[PDB]
From TrEMBL, chain B:
Entry annotated with the keyword Transmembrane: no
Family designation: Belongs to the peptidase C59 family.
Span of domain Choloylglycine hydrolase/NAAA C-terminal: 2-287
Entry protein name: Choloylglycine hydrolase
Coiled-coil residue spans: none
Superkingdom as given in the UniProt entry: Bacteria
Keyword Endoplasmic reticulum assigned: no
Gene Ontology MF term list: hydrolase activity
Pfam families reported in the protein's UniProt record: CBAH (PF02275)
Biological source species: Bacteroides thetaiotaomicron (strain ATCC 29148 / DSM 2079 / JCM 5827 / CCUG 10774 / NCTC 10582 / VPI-5482 / E50)
Record keywords: Hydrolase, Signal
Length: 326, 325, 328, 328
C-alpha cells in the first residue's frame, strides 16, 4: 500500500515524503492540534496517559485515528501497513494503547527520534489493534519517525516483540516484508543498477527500491523551491495509478493522497489524487498555544484548496479515536 | 524523453495525456490562436501556405515552435523525440515545411485523423528540421494525432520515407524504437504480465510498457472528475523524477511539465513539475473567432495558476516560428 | 521450443549449436546419407525432383522428417518451430515441397548459403505442411542455414510470402515472434546489459537474449578443444530443464537432445539429456560415395554411445518421409 | 561463483547437485578414502584429532583441500564461497581447524546431518582459513550438508559466530548474501513467478532463484533413470558458460565441473565442462575396508573417463592438506 522516503540534503535539509494507497476512499482529514492537550491511549482498557508537549499537524484515516503527521519541532511520524505484524502474544497484561492513537502519541511527546526510541524501548505498553471498519483489513501497521536532524527509526512488531532500526541510512520504508528482509531485497536490485533495470510494479518491494534509488539521485539542494517538488516527484513515481484493476485482480489499492513534510522550514504539504492542487500548511504561521483550540481542514466532501491553506482552517472539535471493533 | 498515452473510455470519452522530458528548462508557454490566421512553412525556402481552419490552444518549446496542443474539434497533436528520424534524402526539392510549424500545421487544418492522414499521405511537402539552439539535440521528432472519435495516427520519418500507423489501438507513443519495433517490445512484456513484472526505468521502451498497461487498467468511466485524474496519474507514473543524475550519467532528461487534453469536453489541462497546481484552459470558454486576437498563458516567469486560467489569458503577439539556427 | 546459436571464431571457426525441446519423446535418430540420392518433395502432389550433390549426417523427428543436419561442405540446416508460419496463399498451384524433407533439400543441393538463398528466392515451390500425426502440432516451422564461411540466413514464411534475413550477424534464432520483431526484443535487453540483468525464463524471446549474449562472450579462439565445449555450455544455458511442469502448466516443452556442428573440421557433435555422453560423427571419416549404403545411429532404443560413433554406425534403410496426416 | 541444489523425490530419493565455478583451472582430482583413516585438522597449532568412521569419495580444489564429496552413509558435504565469512574474533584460543580439511572432517565422522549439527553446535574448534595460494582469494566459504534422509544444514560463520540453518526446505545454496538474507531475495522472486520472469544472470542470488524454482519443477520420481539427468538439467541451467568475458570484465568465474550425488543408491556422478562424458563412482562397488588403499581418479592431465570409473581408479598417495599459504 503506502510508501515513504526521506531526503537528506545540504545544511539540515530534511524532507519526508509519504504515499497513501487504499482500496477505497480513505476519507482522510487534516487536524491541527495545539500543545497541552491530555489524551488516553484507550477507553476501556488499562492505559497510559500524557499531556501533549508539542502541537502537531496530522492527517487522519476515516477520522478514527492518526496515520501521518508532523509536530512543531520537525518530527514526522507515519503509520504504514505491514500484514505480518503481531503486537503481542496471548496473556499480555500491560497497559493497552490503541492502534489509532499510537501515531499521535509519538508526535505529542517527542521532539527527537533519540527521545522516541529511548522511551519506546521501555516497552511499558502494548499495542491494541482491532479490525478496521467497513469489514476492512486488520490494523497491522509499522511506523517510521524522522526528526529535523535526519535520523530515522523504523518501528515494527513481529510475533509480539519490538523491532527497531535507528539511523540516518534508513530513509525508505514500504509494506511487507520485514525491514531487514526489505533491505536485502533492495541490496540485490542495487547490484542490477537503477539506470539499467528497476522493478516497476505496484508491489511493496518494487516501490521500495524505486524510492530508494530515486531519493538519492534527485538534486542535492537546500532550496525548498527545488527539494520539495523533486521529493514529491519521486512520490508520484512510487505512487500507483488511480483505480487500477484487472479481471484477475479486481480490487487493488490506489493512491488517494500524498504528503511531503519540509522538516527544516516546518511546512506540511499535502495533495489528493482527485484534486488538482498541492496545498500546504506553514506550521510557522500556526498558533500551537494551549488556548488556541482545535482547528480542522476538511477534505472529505471534495473541497479544493490551493497555496497556503491556513486561511481555510475552521474551528472544530477533535475527532474521537476509536478503540473498538465497529 | 517524452511519453504519450491515449485513454478510450465509454460514451466517446477520449483523453490524451503527455509528458515533457528535457534536460534543461524548456521555457514553454501556452498560446491561444484564433482561427483564420495565415502561416507559412518556412521563411527562406519554397513552401506551402495555409489559413488556419480551426483555432487551438498549444504549448511551445523555447517559444520557437509548437510541440503540443488541441484545437476546436478536439484533435490533439504531440511532437515527441525520435533520434533515428530522417525526414528526407539528399536532393529533395519538394516544399520544405519547418519542424517547428509541423505540429501547428496539423492543429490548424484538420479536424479528423482521417483528414490529417489523407493529406499527409500525398507527401506534397518535406520536413526541414534544423538543430535545436544552443548545442541542443538535432530536431529528430515523430508526431501523434488523436481526434474526438478515439482514432490515433503515428507519423514517423524513417530513412527519408514517411511511415504512418493509424488506428484506435495505437494509444501509446514514446521515443525509440520505430513504432513497429516498439510494439514488439510491448508484446514481449505483456507475456510477462503487468502485475507480475514491469520495467521501471526512465527508458523509452520501459515508459512505453508502463503507460500501455496502466492506461487499460484505470477505471472505464465517462466522468471527467475521474478520467482526467486517472490518466494524469498514469502520466506521473511514466514521468522522470526531477533533476535525476548519477556519477555515471551527469545529465538525464527530466520531466518538466505534463498535459492532459480532455478531447470530449474540449478542456486542456496543464501542470508543471516545479509548480504546485494543475490548471486548465476550457476551449468552450475561449473565443476562436477570426479576429479575437492572439492570447498567451505565460509560464517562463515562474507564475502559479490554479483552476481555469482563461481569466489569466493576456493579449499577446504570436511567437516567431524559427526555421534556421 | 528450440534454440539455435552460431559461434563465429577466428581463422574460419564456425560452430553452430542447437537445442530440441518437445512435449514427449521425439524418437529421434541420426542418419548418414551419401551422395547421389534421389528424393521427391512430396508423395501425391506435383513436385520437384533432385539428385543429392552433397552427402550429410542428419537428425530426424519421429523418423518422419529431417529437422537438423550438416552436409560435407560444412553447411548446417536447422528447422525450428514458428507458430505464426503461413507457407502459401489459397489457390497456389506451385509444386509442393513437403515440410518433412524441406530441410533435407537444403543439405542435399547447396554448399554455401549464397547458393541456398539464390535458389529459394526464385520461389519455384511451395511448402506443403500437413498436421502432425496423432494430435500433434501444426507443421509451422522456420529454418536457419549456415555455411563454413559463417554467413547465416533465416528463412520464414509469413502470410504466404517468403522472408529472408541474410548476414553473418544473424547468429541466433529461436521461435516466435518473426525475426524482425525478435531482434527488436533482443535490442531492448542489450540496452539493459547482459551482466546487469538477463531474462531467465524458458520462453522463446528470453532464450534468444541469453544465446545472443553468451555466444559473443565465450572465448574467441580457433581451437576446437575450447570452442566446442564452450558452445555446448551456451546451448545448455539456453536449454530448458527436463520434465519441467507445474500444477498451473501441466505440459511444458523440455529439451531432449543437443547438437553442435563444427563446420570448420566437419564434426557433428550430439548428446541427449537422458544419456550421459556427448558423442560425435566425424564427417572426414565417412564415405559419402554414391553407393556407400545408408547408415543410421539408433537412438530410440535407449542406446548409449561415446566418443567417435562412426564405428557404431549400422547398415540401415532410410526412413519414410511423411507428407500427409495418417488416419488414426 | 558456484551453486548447490538438493532434489527431494519420492521413496527416499535424495539427489544433490553442485557446480564448481572458478576463474582459472581448479586443478581438481577425485580421491577415494577408505574408512578408519586418522587425520588432524591442522599442522602447526593446537588441534583436534579423529579417525574415519566412514569412507568418502571426494573432489579436491588444487589438491590442497576437500571441497565436495560423499561418504558411505549417503552424506554429502559441499563447501561453497561466501565473501562475508568471518570465522572467529581476535583472541580465540580454541583448537584450530583448517578450512582445507573441514569438509573432510564432516564426511569422516557423521552419517546424518543431525550428528553433524549436534557436534558443531558444541563450538569445540575454530576454523583457521589462510589465503589461497599464489595470489588467490581469501578462504571465506560456507558448507551445506545433506544426509540420505533429505535433511540439509547450511553452516555459515558470520561475524565470528557459527550460524546453522537446519531443515528439509533448505535445498539450495549459492554465495552472497547471508542465508537469512538470501532466502528473502528468493522470496521476492517467488512473488514474481518462475514462469513469468526469472533472473537469468550469473549472479549468486540469480542462480539461487533459478535453482530453487527448477529443482521443484523437475518430475517427482524415484527412478534414477530420470532423477539424475533431471538434476543434471538444473545444475546445467544454473551453471555459467565457459570463459565468459567482456571488455569491462576480463575475468569471470566460469563453471569447470559439476557433481551429482545419488544419496539413495550411493552413486557419485561427475562431469567436467571440457570433457564430453559424464562418469560416476559407484560406492557400492568400492571397498572402504580399513586397508583397501587410498585411490585416485586423476583429472589434471585431460583424462577422459566414461561410465563406471571404479575400473580406472589407480592406487596413489593422498594429497597434502594446506594449512598455511606457501611462500612465493
Amino acid at each position: 500500500m503506502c510508501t515513504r522516503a526521506v531526503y537528506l540534503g545540504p545544511d539540515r535539509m530534511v524532507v519526508t515524503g509519504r504515499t497513501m494507497d487504499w482500496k477505497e476512499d480513505i476519507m482522510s482529514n487534516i487536524y491541527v492540534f495545539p500543545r497541552g492537550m491530555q489524551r488516553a491511549g484507550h477507553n476501556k482498557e488499562k492505559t497510559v496517559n500524557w499531556t501533549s508537549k508539542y502541537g502537531s499537524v496530522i492527517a487522519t484515516g476515516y477520522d478514527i485515528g492518526t496515520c501521518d503527521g508532523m509536530n512543531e519541532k520537525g518530527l514526522v511520524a507515519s503509520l504504514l501497513f505491514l500484514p505480518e505484524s503481531v503486537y503481542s502474544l496471548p496473556g499480555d497484561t500491560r497497559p493497552a494503547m490503541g492502534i489509532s492513537i499510537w501515531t499521535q502519541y509519538v508526535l505529542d511527546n517527542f521532539a527527537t527520534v533519540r527521545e522516541a526510541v529511548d522511551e519506546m524501548k521501555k516497552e511499558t505498553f502494548r499495542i491494541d489493534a482491532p479490525r478496521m471498519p467497513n469489514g476492512g483489513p486488520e490494523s497491522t501497521l509499522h511506523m517510521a519517525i524522522t526528526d529535523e536532524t535526519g535520523n530515522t527509526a523504523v518501528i515494527e512488531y513481529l510475533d509480539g516483540k519490538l523491532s527497531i532500526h535507528e539511523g540516518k541510512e534508513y530513509q525508505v520504508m514500504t509494506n511487507s516484508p520485514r525491514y531487514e528482509l526489505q533491505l536485502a531485497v533492495n541490496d540485490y536490485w542495487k547490484e542490477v543498477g537503477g539506470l539499467q533495470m528497476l522493478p516497476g510494479t505496484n508491489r511493496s518491494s518494487d516501490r521500495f527500491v524505486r524510492a530508494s534509488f530515486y531519493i538519492h539521485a534527485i538534486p542535492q539542494t537546500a532550496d525548498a523551491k527545488i527539494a520539495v517538488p523533486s521529493v514529491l516527484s519521486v512520490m508520484r513515481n512510487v505512487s500507483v495509478p488511480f483505480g487500477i484493476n484487472t479481471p484477475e485482480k479486481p480490487h487493488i489499492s490506489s493512491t488517494r493522497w500524498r504528503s511531503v513534510s519540509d522538516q527544516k522550514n516546518k511546512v506540511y504539504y499535502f495533495e489528493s489524487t482527485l484534486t488538482p492542487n498541492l496545498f500546504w500548511l506553514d506550521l510557522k504561521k500556526i498558533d500551537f498555544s494551549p488556548k488556541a483550540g482545535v482547528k480542522k481542514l476538511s477534505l472529505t466532501k471534495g473541497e479544493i484548496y490551493a497555496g497556503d491553506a491556513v486561511k481555510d482552517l475552521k474551528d472544530s472539535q477533535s475527532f474521537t479515536f476509536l478503540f473498538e471493533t465497529p
